Design a protein around this nucleic acid. Structure first.
Length: 176
RNA sequence: AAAUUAGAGUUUGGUGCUGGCUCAGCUUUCAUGCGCCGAGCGGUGGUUUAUACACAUGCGAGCUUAAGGCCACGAGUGCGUAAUACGCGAGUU
């Protein structure tokens, strides 16, 4: 089989910096009419550029290298952009729930460090979150749902630069 | 110049739930093995944790002009007490 790569993505791999993280690789099972038990390796690859554009890719195949390569290229096909404060923290408090998992995410002032669970440490270093305290609640037994949940939870927040043109009201003085 | 939330493994042919068990965290013992006991300056800590069990012996309240004058402060334990207790807040005959 052959995985796809476009033309205009080939200004980006020559463009931004990039890092790659496999989320988890999982072996599923199916007993099938005719020959027996067919398995697929499902692989989940995250890819960011450490400046606030994040990507996820889920891939399914028969063997582990081909599965991780498919999810590797699927993530690099699928990128979404996430606003940060100066590349280290998120704008608001963030709460979200994918499948039924209660993530709770807070901003922290820069130089707090990442106080953060296992895979989400590489995830926040991937997209570029240097200073965030998180906790995940509910059944945390799946890596895939915390990855997808984290992508949507990043996409939830609100940006202040879409106001100053049209609110008549200037937005500055960040002194605590 | 206000200093502020870590999970993972475990259940099933697999997936997700459902809550439980465990490990990684910090603190804690004259704990129990195995090993050193070089020497000094120190902090500190033992509620002999328990027995409010039985105490050998020695010492802990004597001072002072026979006689008289002053020795209810210090130390220990938590039996009893669920409220004249203890804490907090007002006023006192």
């Amino acid at each position: 089989p052959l995985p796809p790569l476009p033309r205009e993505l080939r200004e980006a791999l020559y463009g931004h910096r990039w890092d790659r993280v496999i989320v988890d690789v999982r072996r599923t099972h199916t007993p099938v009419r005719g020959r027996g038990k067919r398995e697929e390796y499902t692989a989940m690859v995250a890819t960011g550029n450490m400046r606030g554009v994040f990507g996820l890719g889920i891939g399914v195949a028969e063997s582990a290298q081909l599965a991780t390569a498919r999810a590797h290229l699927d993530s690099l096909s699928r990128l979404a952009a996430v606003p940060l404060y100066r590349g280290h923290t998120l704008y608001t408090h963030v709460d979200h729930t994918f499948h039924r998992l209660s993530i709770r995410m807070m901003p922290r002032p820069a130089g707090w460090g990442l106080r953060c669970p296992d895979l989400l440490y590489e995830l926040c270093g991937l997209v570029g979150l240097r200073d965030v305290s998180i906790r995940v609640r509910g059944q945390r037994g799946s890596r895939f749902f915390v990855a997808q949940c984290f992508q949507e939870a990043l996409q939830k927040q609100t940006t202040p630069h879409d106001g100053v043109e049209a609110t008549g009201m200037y937005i500055r003085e960040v002194f605590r």
